[PDB]
């Protein structure tokens, strides 16, 4: 049940890995993986009904 992932290596001394094993049945006990996803800001930065083209007039 071991889970192997790679570290994004900062200052160097192939890819380096680390190993994780979950000891508990409840997922709340698990540490945070930090393997997170990014999204694009559109829903906040451009919430407009008509798609905007930046080179064209915002208002036409």
């Amino acid at each position: 049940g071991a889970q192997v992932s790679s570290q994004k290596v900062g200052a160097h001394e192939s890819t380096i890995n680390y190993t994780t094993i979950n000891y508990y049945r409840d997922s709340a006990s698990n540490a945070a993986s930090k393997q997170d996803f990014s999204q694009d800001p559109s829903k906040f930065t451009e919430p407009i009904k008509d798609v905007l083209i930046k080179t064209a007039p915002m208002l036409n």
Binding site: G1, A2, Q3, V4, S5, S6, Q35
Partner: peptide
Amino acid sequence: AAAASSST
């Protein structure tokens, strides 16, 4: 083991 060790 093959399966289990999942890898990412």
